[PDB]
Structure 1
Amino acid sequence: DIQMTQSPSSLSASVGDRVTITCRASQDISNYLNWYQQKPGKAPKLLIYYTSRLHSGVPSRFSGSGSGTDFTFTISSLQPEDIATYFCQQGNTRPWTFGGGTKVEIKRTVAAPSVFIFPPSDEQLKSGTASVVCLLNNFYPREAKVQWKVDNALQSGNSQESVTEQDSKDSTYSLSSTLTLSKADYEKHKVYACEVTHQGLSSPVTKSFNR
């Protein structure tokens, strides 16, 4: 089989910067080399085919070059909507094979998160469980520290985080931290707080409520 090696596996650049991704085929594939863009949860989209031909709906900031085994994919000026994983693929000899992909990320200025806390609903409590949610909205960089406090006492092991993919418009991230407790443990305490530590914050931010 023809092995496709992509470089780098991931990269970060600012809006307006030139982005270069390469692909090497283990054998000569002439010019039967295609590039796809895949946004998370979405199907790959054909951007370039036959090394340099742009597919329909593709702006000319995307270009491709190469011959033989070595190929280059270029974004002349990186835009916020370009956050995606890019794959090369040879269509010369079966089995058709893909490169491992290159994740393209955006570097931007530090942005502080807006923090929100949500108590469990009455509906959920009636089921025997309590979820407490802390939201960190539109921040940069990705790195953030969320600490749970139950009656001014630090919590561990009973929380899970989820981070969105970098925003297609402003390139920020959002994070949710969910604290799972039994209804019994939740009904025992009064003060529920999430303390957020982030680069964009002058001091750790605490959002709280009384049950």
Structure 2
Amino acid sequence: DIQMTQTTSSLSASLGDRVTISCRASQDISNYLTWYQQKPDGTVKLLIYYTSKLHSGVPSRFSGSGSGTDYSLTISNLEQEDVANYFCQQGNSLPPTFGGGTKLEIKRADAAPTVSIFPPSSEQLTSGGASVVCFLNNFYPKDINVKWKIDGSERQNGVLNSWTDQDSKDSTYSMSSTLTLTKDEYERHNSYTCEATHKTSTSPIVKSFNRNEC
């Protein structure tokens, strides 16, 4: 059914640099290929059609190429507003099909996460629940793993994570990892630990606390 795939989900580059996004089709779409730009606000703008044809109103730093099954979008001099999600669609046959998109992100110096851990509030314990929260703020790159450890055993249930989009100011990422339990389960263990491993250091960032402790 003509499936359009974009192998790269995310792409990192610096301002002024030349970046190229790729799109592949499951069969020959005969040069009928179009590129779109989707900014975070959610707005969509058409950039290039018929593989190489620039749409009216688009800056000349945008270019397109390709043939048969493979196609590519190029941005010669990256500007800050060029930070967006770029996706393709084929106009050769029905149904119209799109690529998953390629998210464009900015490049900066690697930074370690500032980690902080928070025991459940006394106010939440009155409800019967217990949420242990771990903040990992302002690190780069975005790839990161968090590990919840209780005493000696690792814990994978009740852990919900949330990532911010790249900060448009300092180009960093931040993340919250929250371990959720009930009061009884929380009160039957002592050591709660939040471990973060990042490119910036071989050693994991460890923040812990003990419930028995004040």
Matches within 5 A, 1:91-170: 91=91, 94-150=94-150, 153-158=152-157, 159-170=159-170
Give, in whole Å, the separation in 1 of the partners of 2:53 and 2:8: 22
Deviation at residue 8 of structure 1 after TM alignment: 4.2
CA distance in 1, matches of 2:61, 2:82: 11
- Give the distance between the partners of 1:5 and 1:23, measured in 2 at CA: 7
Instruction: State the Cα deviation string for residues 70-116 of structure 1 (Å, max 9, x = none).
Output: 64311113456545432122446654332343344444331111112
Alpha-carbon deviation of 1:167?
Answer: 3.4
Matched, 1:177 2:177: yes
Question: Contact 2:37 / 2:47 at 8 angstroms: preserved in 1?
Answer: no
Partner of 2:53: 52
Distance (Å, rounded) in 1 between the aligned partners of 2:193 and 2:108:
30
- For the structure 1 residues 140 and 80, does the alpha-carbon distance in structure 2 shift closer, same or farther, using more than 3 Å as the test? farther
Give the CA deviation at 1:54: 4.5
One-letter code aligned to 1:171? S
Query: Structure 2: 5+ residue runs without aligned partners?
Result: none
Instruction: Give the Cα separation in 1 of the matches to 2:68 and 2:187.
Output: 68
Q: CA deviation at 1:48?
A: 0.7
TM-score computed with the length of structure 2 as normaliser: 0.70
> Are 1:120 and 1:131, in contact at CA under 8 Å, matched by a contact in 2?
yes
TM-superposed deviation, 1:209: 4.5
The CA distance in 1 between the partners of 2:146 and 2:42, in whole Å, is 33
SS of the residue corresponding to residue 77 of structure 1 reads coil
C-alpha displacement of 1:180: 1.7
How many residues matched?
A: 205
Residues 46, 55 of structure 1: 8 Å contact kept = no
Identity of aligned residues (%): 59
Tell me the alpha carbon deviations over residues 149-193 of structure 1, each in whole angstroms, 9 at most, x when there is no partner: 55x545422334333344344333222221122112323455544
Kept in 1: contact 2:136–2:174 (CA 8 A)? yes
Distance (whole Å) between structure 2 residues aligned to residue 193 and residue 11 of structure 1: 31
What letter matches 1:64 in structure 2?
A: G
**CA–CA distance in structure 1, aligned partners of residues 6 and 145 of structure 2:** 31
Corresponding position of 1:76: 76
- Matched residues in 2 for 1:67 and 1:200: separation? 41
What's the Cα RMSD here? 3.6
How many angstroms does 1:129 deviate by? 0.9
TM-score for the superposition, normalised by structure 1: 0.71
Question: One-letter code of the match for 1:175?
Answer: M
Question: In structure 1, the residue corresponding to 2:187 is in which secondary structure?
Answer: helix
Write the distance in 1 (CA, Å) between the matches of 2:29 and 2:82. 30
SS in structure 1 at match of 2:77? coil
1:132-162, Cα deviation, whole Å (9 max, x unpaired): 1101111122343434455x54542233433
The structure-2 alpha-carbon separation of the partners of 1:60 and 1:124, relative to structure 1 and needing over 3 Å to count, comes to: farther
